[PDB]
Amino acid sequence: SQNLVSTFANKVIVEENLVNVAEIDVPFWSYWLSSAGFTSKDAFVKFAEAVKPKVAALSTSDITNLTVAFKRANYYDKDLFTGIEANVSANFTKFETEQLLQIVATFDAFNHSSVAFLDDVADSITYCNHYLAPVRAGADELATLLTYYAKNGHERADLLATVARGFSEVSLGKLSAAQRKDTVLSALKAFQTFGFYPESIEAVIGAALVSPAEYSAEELKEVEAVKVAAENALGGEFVLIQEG
Amino acid sequence: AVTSFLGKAFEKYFYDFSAYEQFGLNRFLSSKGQYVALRHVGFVMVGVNVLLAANFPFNPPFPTIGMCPAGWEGTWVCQADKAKALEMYKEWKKSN
Amino acid sequence: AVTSFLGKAFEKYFYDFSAYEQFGLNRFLSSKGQYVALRHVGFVMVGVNVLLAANFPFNPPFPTIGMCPAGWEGTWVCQADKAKALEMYKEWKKSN
Amino acid sequence: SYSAYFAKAGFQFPAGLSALVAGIVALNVCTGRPTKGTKEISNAEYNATPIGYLQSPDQHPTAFPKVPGMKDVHGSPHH
Amino acid sequence: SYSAYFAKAGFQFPAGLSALVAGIVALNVCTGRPTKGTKEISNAEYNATPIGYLQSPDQHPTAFPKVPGMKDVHGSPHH
Amino acid sequence: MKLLPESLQQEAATAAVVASWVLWHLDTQLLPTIMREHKLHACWAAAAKRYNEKLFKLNPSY
Amino acid sequence: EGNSVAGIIKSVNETSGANLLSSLKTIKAQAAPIYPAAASSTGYSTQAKIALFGALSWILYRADGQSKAHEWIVDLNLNVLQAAWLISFSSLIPFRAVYFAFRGMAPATASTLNGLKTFSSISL
Amino acid sequence: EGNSVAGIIKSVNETSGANLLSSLKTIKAQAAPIYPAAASSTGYSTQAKIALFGALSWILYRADGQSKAHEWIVDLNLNVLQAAWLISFSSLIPFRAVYFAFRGMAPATASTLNGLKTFSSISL
Amino acid sequence: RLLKLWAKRLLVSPELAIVPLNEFDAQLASKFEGISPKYQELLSAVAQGNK
Amino acid sequence: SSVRDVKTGSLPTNFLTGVYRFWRSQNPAEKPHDPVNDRLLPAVVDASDKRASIGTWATTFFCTIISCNLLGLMPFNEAPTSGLGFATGLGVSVWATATILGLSKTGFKFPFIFVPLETISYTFRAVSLGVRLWVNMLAGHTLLHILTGMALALPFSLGFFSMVPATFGVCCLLSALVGLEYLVAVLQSGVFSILSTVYVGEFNHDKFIGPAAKIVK
Numbered sequence A: 001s002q003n004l005v006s007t008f009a010n011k012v013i014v015e016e017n018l019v020n021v022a023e024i025d026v027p028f029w030s031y032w033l034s035s036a037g038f039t040s041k042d043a044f045v046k047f048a049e050a051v052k053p054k055v056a057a058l059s060t061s062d063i064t065n066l067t068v069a070f071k072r073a074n075y076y077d078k079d080l081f082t083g084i085e086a087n088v089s090a091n092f093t094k095f096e097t098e099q100l101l102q103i104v105a106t107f108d109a110f111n112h113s114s115v116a117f118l119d120d121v122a123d124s125i126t127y128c129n130h131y132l133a134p135v136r137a138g139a140d141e142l143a144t145l146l147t148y149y150a151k152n153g154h155e156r157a158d159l160l161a162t163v164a165r166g167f168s169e170v171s172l173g174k175l176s177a178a179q180r181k182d183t184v185l186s187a188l189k190a191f192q193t194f195g196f197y198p199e200s201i202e203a204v205i206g207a208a209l210v211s212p213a214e215y216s217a218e219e220l221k222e223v224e225a226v227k228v229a230a231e232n233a234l235g236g237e238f239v240l241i242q243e244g
Numbered sequence B, C: 001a002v003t004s005f006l007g008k009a010f011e012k013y014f015y016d017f018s019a020y021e022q023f024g025l026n027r028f029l030s031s032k033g034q035y036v037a038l039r040h041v042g043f044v045m046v047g048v049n050v051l052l053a054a055n056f057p058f059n060p061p062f063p064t065i066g067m068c069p070a071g072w073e074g075t076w077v078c079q080a081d082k083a084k085a086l087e088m089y090k091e092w093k094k095s096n
Numbered sequence D, E: 001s002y003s004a005y006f007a008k009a010g011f012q013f014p015a016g017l018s019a020l021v022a023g024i025v026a027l028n029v030c031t032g033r034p035t036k037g038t039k040e041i042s043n044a045e046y047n048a049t050p051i052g053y054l055q056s057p058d059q060h061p062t063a064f065p066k067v068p069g070m071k072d073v074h075g076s077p078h079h
Numbered sequence F: 001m002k003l004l005p006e007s008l009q010q011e012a013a014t015a016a017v018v019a020s021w022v023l024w025h026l027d028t029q030l031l032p033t034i035m036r037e038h039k040l041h042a043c044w045a046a047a048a049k050r051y052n053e054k055l056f057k058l059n060p061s062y
Numbered sequence G, H: 001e002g003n004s005v006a007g008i009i010k011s012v013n014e015t016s017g018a019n020l021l022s023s024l025k026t027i028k029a030q031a032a033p034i035y036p037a038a039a040s041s042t043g044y045s046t047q048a049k050i051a052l053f054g055a056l057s058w059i060l061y062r063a064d065g066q067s068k069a070h071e072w073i074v075d076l077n078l079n080v081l082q083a084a085w086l087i088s089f090s091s092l093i094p095f096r097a098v099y100f101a102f103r104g105m106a107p108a109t110a111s112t113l114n115g116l117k118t119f120s121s122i123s124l
Numbered sequence I: 001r002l003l004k005l006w007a008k009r010l011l012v013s014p015e016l017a018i019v020p021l022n023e024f025d026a027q028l029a030s031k032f033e034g035i036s037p038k039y040q041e042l043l044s045a046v047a048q049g050n051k
Numbered sequence J: 001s002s003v004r005d006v007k008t009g010s011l012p013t014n015f016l017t018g019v020y021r022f023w024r025s026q027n028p029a030e031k032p033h034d035p036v037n038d039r040l041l042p043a044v045v046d047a048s049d050k051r052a053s054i055g056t057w058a059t060t061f062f063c064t065i066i067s068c069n070l071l072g073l074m075p076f077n078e079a080p081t082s083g084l085g086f087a088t089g090l091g092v093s094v095w096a097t098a099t100i101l102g103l104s105k106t107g108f109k110f111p112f113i114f115v116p117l118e119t120i121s122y123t124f125r126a127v128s129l130g131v132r133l134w135v136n137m138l139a140g141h142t143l144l145h146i147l148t149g150m151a152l153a154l155p156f157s158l159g160f161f162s163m164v165p166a167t168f169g170v171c172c173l174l175s176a177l178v179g180l181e182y183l184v185a186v187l188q189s190g191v192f193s194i195l196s197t198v199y200v201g202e203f204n205h206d207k208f209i210g211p212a213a214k215i216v217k
């Protein structure tokens, strides 16, 4: 029986029959296989064609699972993400901010944007979801959504007021010191792109000025470029609070 | 979802996935009706050997016909009376 | 039907049928609030006397304060220790 | 009004009351010990013993005792 | 066709199956006798006895015995 | 009288099962129902000055 | 199910100028919210049958255990003392006042719903 | 719910002579019998959840009792001998032929329904 | 078209008839809180229905 | 999968709203120094995250005890909290909930001759919270058992309907004792949950993570 198991192993338990079981529920199976590290381009081509007649009827949890799965596999199928962005645009009231921040980060990984998608995502975060949902988001996810709107030039000041609520000493403090640097430097470029300087930009600038040794000389120049621009917009002087 | 996939999965296994065709047993076997007779006794022989391999060091409650499993032949596994085999197993268990 | 009548029946009893008005207890009693205080203790006193009359010849598990029910005064009903009262009851039971 | 809509649904239990009565019963039946006045015995003793000797008088109190402490069965007379 | 109407109703039990499992369980729990390897004892004996002495070895067989007749508990050593 | 039970762990785990069911039934069945009914009233009462002002500025009817 | 205001707009626009005023009660009823009518009376639910038989089985089980107790006659008369207060609570408690006192415990029922006003949403 | 033939008679009589032939497919669909469409998929019924958990609880209870038996390894291998025939019955039994053999057991399904003929109920 | 316009408003919100058309502008103000309270509580109570 | 429909303004919804808002009122959130706006909104949500759910826990313990206490006043029924392991098992569970909350703040490390005496006062809250519930459900029912036996001795000995006024006066004192046990059943559920808000609320303190940077004027 040393070879009867090995004969069964080379023909039955193959990656191709792992795919043939995975064809029934692609948003479930591609999400959990890629979570286990199975990020293979040849299988995710077969995932993209199996789910394409089913995308328009997918739920918001299935769309978010499918979009995160194709981000971890790093596979871009433009006809798949067209139907994915047509599902988000048709059901934007049903989507959540926690789900849309994962969908936007996939749409920002490979540059894929529509003007209807940017409007329906901004309407979903600002009006269809709770206004304190960016507080629960995590600042690394909100800075990705800010960069995605800055790169497409889409100015939505109602969205920018909602996303800026998530930046604080709480949410930036939960990040790694290297990860806080990339979050601060990408949120300050997006706030300077639209010319929007909310009151919660004091936490983004203050996260850079309380620890400037992580930042370079040219980075502290563009931080204090935003700091003087927010000082004119908010009408005051920047001061660091010390507890006591 | 969890039930709708499992119905679609087992339907593919019951009908579409056949190991009689994928392994090419038409060369070795005559009929599909004699393959399922060999798959029947093959299922019994595996389930006998798996249930014994799941716990091999046991004294058998079934009567062995004067035969011993491995190189034991005097241990608690081969003892006829079970009251003696319980005392011999307790000495073997504390060492191992 | 069986439930719809019983709802209509008890609704008539709970609200429409009042024994405070049909018996004319306004002459004897001051308030309806003091009638339901007397109907409360009257319910307790009946339920005490009914539970005792449902089985009167019993030896009490509660301590009687040196008192006897009827003309017994030496029988098993009045015995202090229950091991003696069980033997005295068995002689009384075969006769009666 | 919506009064006739709410009379359509009858009595209903609370939503997870089956899991409450499952947990309360499983705490009373999966005790891991003999059941309150009984003792586990051998199979040789159980088969040889009549039902009347297998019962104990304390576990059968009288339903409405005329004397406090009356038992329904007398048990085994062998001490 | 009426095929999609009959797929609407899920699995259903037979119509009086609750009365069948009520009658079968009541024949197994209302036996009027101690439960298969136990014996009713006095309340004085039950309270004085530890749980390990209250159990018997025959009523606790080993789940996968290496020797036929292994018991999970040893019971009371007092004979 | 009854002072100590037959098992102290069984009576404590019964209290743990009953209180965890009430904790589950409150957080899952009662408080989502309570807060749907409370915060519909509470959000309307907290917005109605700013809601009616925002709606007044929007419509061109006047 | 489409919304009823767009059905009002569609039915008023489609009607003639001659029969507009007569057909306004028909358009009013087509946009009226559904209030389901009183259905046929059914005596007991299945879960209501389990609840009443289960409470009856529990009462008979506890009355059988109380009667076999040592202080058995004290246990059955404590059921008389306890059931007498359930009768007195039906007599004493102002059940309309307690209903409105509980209604004032929640802020959703202690006040009327203050929201959208008429002048802010007038459509001309 | 009125019957559909009187609705056919009412709709055909009320129609114009000009639009009679065009509206015949509309009157055909209004009298078509209702065939309810495929509803949304639900995974398990409540009674299907009791049946599968109850069969799983029964299997685990019987496997625990078989393993504690005296001839315990014979009991677990008798489950192998019994489950092997359940696999062989899925392979051998002609499930379409057995379905039509059972269909011929009842006289209601062994023949087609012979009843009312066309010429006896022609209405001119 | 004028009758059809007012038929839609009075089918949805029939309490607009308690305000005369010539006195509607005399209720308005720049802020909503400054709108005249002559018709506020009467409009809110007729809108609740005939019960 | 299909949840039931609820009528708005139902009496159990209005009762449980006022009950939950009462135990939430016992540990109110602290007013920050800064005005609450979009700058201070994440610090308010984070301060709410660091607060324990004492409002939810106390109305869990209020409803589970006032239901258990009133079972002792229903006919053919006894109170679960009249048993020792049930009532004290709830009180040690509250004390262990407050201790685990207090230990999770510092390090999960347990904090000259003064602190052994303050420890005895703290660990007596484990005993006294559940024992006060247990003795109140026991001693009121035990006194009811003795006085019902002494009230039964009169119509047993002096005739059933023979003489009324002596058995009337003891049935009035017995009826006032069951009404006192109704008051104790509601009060001891309240005292338990008041003290649970006090004990858990001692460790319900975290520092407000306010703005580290500000644009003043």
Ligand SMILES: CCCCCCCCCCCCCCCCCC(=O)O[C@@H](COC(=O)CCCCCCCCCCCCCCC)COP(=O)(O)OCCN
Pocket (backbone or CB within 6 Å): A012, A021, B003, B004, B005, B006, B007, B008, B009, B010, B013, E010, H042, H043, H044, H083, H084, H086, H087, H090
């Ligand atoms: C070779 C590698 C293996 C790959 C692994 C994946 C392949 C599947 C392998 C086997 C999985 C078995 C799962 C079967 C149970 C779940 C299927 C199911 O119940 O779904 C539907 C299908 O139901 C059935 O499958 C019933 C079929 C039973 C017929 C008997 C078949 C042969 C049985 C052999 C006897 C085995 C005895 C034990 C042997 C050890 C019914 O539910 P539904 O909601 O989807 O339907 C809609 C109505 N609500």
Ligand SMILES: CCCCCCCCCCCCCCCCCC(=O)O[C@@H](COC(=O)CCCCCCCCCCCCCCC)COP(=O)(O)OCCN
Pocket (backbone or CB within 6 Å): C003, C004, C005, C006, C007, C008, C009, C010, C013, D010, G042, G043, G044, G083, G084, G086, G087, G090
């Ligand atoms: C004076 C002579 C007596 C004449 C005899 C007839 C008069 C009736 C006497 C008492 C009969 C009691 C029967 C009550 C139970 C049956 C009523 C019922 O359940 O029907 C409805 C009414 O339900 C109730 O009656 C509940 C009322 C309970 C409130 C509490 C009242 C006072 C209780 C006092 C405590 C007693 C404790 C024990 C004392 C010994 C609900 O069902 P439905 O289907 O008809 O409703 C439609 C929804 N499907």
Ligand SMILES: CCCCCCCCCCCCCCCCCC(=O)O[C@@H](COC(=O)CCCCCCCCCCCCCCC)COP(=O)(O)OCCN
Pocket (backbone or CB within 6 Å): D009, D010, D011, D012, D013, D017, D018, D021, G042, G043, G044, G045, G047, G048, G049, G050, G051, G052, G053, G054, G055, G086, G087, G089, G090, G093
């Ligand atoms: C507080 C002040 C004093 C007030 C008066 C004293 C209080 C005690 C009075 C006793 C009356 C209690 C309520 C009366 C209930 C019976 C009358 C009744 O109305 O019956 C209805 C239902 O009554 C009941 O069934 C309630 C019984 C509750 C007892 C609970 C015992 C539990 C035993 C079973 C547990 C099994 C759990 C299984 C989990 C799946 C009929 O239901 P329906 O289907 O026709 O629709 C009407 C629904 N609104």
Ligand SMILES: CCCCCCCCCCCCCCCCCC(=O)O[C@@H](COC(=O)CCCCCCCCCCCCCCC)COP(=O)(O)OCCN
Pocket (backbone or CB within 6 Å): D012, D013, D014, D015, D016, D017, D018, D019, D022, D025, D026, D029, D030, F020, F021, F024, J001
């Ligand atoms: C160890 C051996 C034990 C053997 C003893 C017998 C126990 C057998 C165990 C299986 C019996 C059945 C289990 C019941 C749980 C599953 C049912 C369920 O999910 O609940 C409801 C299904 O609907 C739901 O609500 C689902 C939600 C889950 C139920 C409860 C969740 C867990 C609550 C426990 C507290 C959790 C918090 C603490 C956890 C450590 C149905 O309940 P109902 O009949 O009372 O309501 C229907 C009335 N119309």
Ligand SMILES: CCCCCCCCCCCCCCCCCC(=O)O[C@@H](COC(=O)CCCCCCCCCCCCCCC)COP(=O)(O)OCCN
Pocket (backbone or CB within 6 Å): D019, D020, D022, D023, D024, D026, D027, D030, D031, D032, D033, E051, F007, F008, F009, F010, F013, F016, F017, F018, F020, F021
């Ligand atoms: C840090 C977070 C941890 C989360 C865990 C939460 C735990 C508490 C939540 C409430 C659930 C309590 C149920 C657990 C009971 C455990 C009792 C136990 O371990 O001992 C049992 C061990 O007994 C056995 O060996 C038999 C197996 C018993 C299993 C118990 C099943 C009941 C589980 C209750 C269902 C919980 C969910 C229901 C709704 C809340 C029986 O106790 P005993 O004193 O009578 O016997 C001891 C041995 N002589």
Ligand SMILES: CCCCCCCCCCCCCCCCCC(=O)O[C@@H](COC(=O)CCCCCCCCCCCCCCC)COP(=O)(O)OCCN
Pocket (backbone or CB within 6 Å): E009, E010, E011, E012, E013, E017, E018, E021, H042, H043, H044, H045, H047, H048, H049, H050, H051, H052, H053, H054, H055, H086, H087, H089, H090, H093
């Ligand atoms: C005969 C030739 C050989 C054939 C193959 C071998 C036979 C054995 C094969 C085993 C398969 C048996 C049937 C498979 C059932 C499970 C798969 C399935 O289809 O699940 C359905 C239901 O399956 C079951 O639940 C059946 C389970 C039956 C086991 C009974 C055990 C009883 C335990 C609980 C008793 C409690 C009684 C309570 C009374 C109120 C799903 O139901 P649904 O709600 O989605 O709607 C579909 C209804 N058409």
Ligand SMILES: CCCCCCCCCCCCCCCCCC(=O)O[C@@H](COC(=O)CCCCCCCCCCCCCCC)COP(=O)(O)OCCN
Pocket (backbone or CB within 6 Å): E012, E013, E014, E015, E016, E017, E018, E019, E022, E025, E026, E029, E030
């Ligand atoms: C002595 C102490 C025993 C204690 C042990 C526990 C037993 C407790 C007894 C109460 C438990 C529940 C009793 C169940 C009977 C009432 C329910 C019922 O009437 O049956 C069905 C209600 O619908 C009916 O069919 C009513 C018809 C009556 C049921 C059975 C009639 C009697 C059959 C027995 C054989 C009679 C012939 C011989 C008689 C000598 C519901 O059954 P199902 O859940 O399986 O079906 C629902 C599936 N969707």
Ligand SMILES: CCCCCCCCCCCCCCCCCC(=O)O[C@@H](COC(=O)CCCCCCCCCCCCCCC)COP(=O)(O)OCCN
Pocket (backbone or CB within 6 Å): D051, E019, E020, E022, E023, E024, E026, E027, E030, E031, E032, E033
């Ligand atoms: C001429 C027409 C007569 C019509 C009557 C039809 C009777 C047969 C129909 C089928 C029903 C059978 C159920 C009756 C069982 C009676 C058994 C019995 O009397 O003895 C019990 C007496 O035991 C007890 O004292 C405890 C009480 C047991 C009550 C039994 C309840 C079960 C009833 C089954 C439900 C029937 C309906 C369910 C669906 C058919 C227990 O038997 P045992 O040998 O284990 O113990 C004897 C004493 N050591």
Ligand SMILES: CCCCCCCCCCCCCCCCCC(=O)O[C@@H](COC(=O)CCCCCCCCCCCCCCC)COP(=O)(O)OCCN
Pocket (backbone or CB within 6 Å): G094, G095, G096, G097, G098, G099, G100, G101, G102, J009, J010, J011, J012, J182, J183, J186
């Ligand atoms: C949508 C379905 C609705 C169903 C309809 C049911 C309607 C009947 C209500 C069910 C009865 C529930 C019994 C609960 C009793 C609680 C008593 C209470 O709420 O206290 C007072 C609360 O009112 C107060 O403002 C406080 C006055 C001091 C009273 C002290 C209250 C403590 C009582 C605790 C209960 C102790 C005994 C427990 C009995 C089970 C009520 O008095 P009031 O309305 O006359 O006073 C309001 C001013 N007019």
Ligand SMILES: CCCCCCCCCCCCO[C@@H]1O[C@H](CO)[C@@H](O[C@H]2O[C@H](CO)[C@@H](O)[C@H](O)[C@H]2O)[C@H](O)[C@H]1O
Pocket (backbone or CB within 6 Å): G100, G101, G102, G103, G104, G105, G110, J066, J186
């Ligand atoms: C389970 C058995 C029962 C145990 C119940 C124990 C909890 C009882 C909670 C109710 C007690 C509090 O009683 C509460 O009193 C306050 C005032 O203080 C009332 O509050 C208000 O009532 C009404 C509002 O409609 C007005 O008169 C007034 O604005 C105010 O008094 C509440 O409406 C009442 O519910």
Ligand SMILES: CCCCCCCCCCCCO[C@@H]1O[C@H](CO)[C@@H](O[C@H]2O[C@H](CO)[C@@H](O)[C@H](O)[C@H]2O)[C@H](O)[C@H]1O
Pocket (backbone or CB within 6 Å): H100, H101, H102, H103, H104, H105, H110
């Ligand atoms: C529970 C496990 C299974 C146990 C089952 C035991 C009972 C089995 C009953 C079926 C056996 C009887 O088998 C029965 O044969 C008769 C002929 O005799 C067939 O009767 C008919 O079948 C078809 C009709 O469509 C035609 O070929 C023909 O008219 C006739 O043969 C039945 O359709 C078949 O069902």
Ligand SMILES: CCCCCCCCCCCCO[C@@H]1O[C@H](CO)[C@@H](O[C@H]2O[C@H](CO)[C@@H](O)[C@H](O)[C@H]2O)[C@H](O)[C@H]1O
Pocket (backbone or CB within 6 Å): H104, H105, H106, H107, H110, H111
């Ligand atoms: C040990 C001896 C007993 C063995 C076990 C007995 C099993 C009993 C179940 C088998 C019964 C099946 O018996 C079945 O009877 C039905 C009655 O509807 C017959 O039904 C059919 O008969 C004939 C011919 O097939 C058809 O023309 C007819 O339309 C139809 O009614 C089937 O032909 C037969 O297959």
Ligand SMILES: CCCCCCCCCCCCO[C@@H]1O[C@H](CO)[C@@H](O[C@H]2O[C@H](CO)[C@@H](O)[C@H](O)[C@H]2O)[C@H](O)[C@H]1O
Pocket (backbone or CB within 6 Å): G104, G105, G106, G107, G110, G111, J017, J018, J019, J021, J022, J186, J187, J189, J190, J191, J194
């Ligand atoms: C031993 C001490 C503890 C005893 C037991 C404690 C019982 C706890 C339950 C009683 C709680 C009832 O508490 C209830 O709180 C609600 C919160 O919605 C208050 O609710 C109401 O307050 C005020 C004034 O009444 C209203 O203007 C307001 O609209 C409404 O919210 C009630 O006034 C109060 O009656």
Ligand SMILES: CCCCCCCCCCCCO[C@@H]1O[C@H](CO)[C@@H](O[C@H]2O[C@H](CO)[C@@H](O)[C@H](O)[C@H]2O)[C@H](O)[C@H]1O
Pocket (backbone or CB within 6 Å): J025, J026, J027, J194, J197, J198, J199, J201, J202
């Ligand atoms: C007719 C008049 C009606 C008056 C109604 C108001 C009184 C109601 C009485 C119910 C009990 C009052 O509840 C009371 O709540 C306060 C806070 O609110 C608790 O106060 C507690 O708060 C926190 C909790 O750790 C501690 O910081 C504080 O030191 C402690 O006192 C009391 O310990 C409790 O007794």
Ligand SMILES: [Zn+2]
Pocket (backbone or CB within 6 Å): G075, G078, J078, J141, J145
């Ligand atoms: Zn008692």
Ligand SMILES: [Zn+2]
Pocket (backbone or CB within 6 Å): H075, H078
């Ligand atoms: Zn066997």
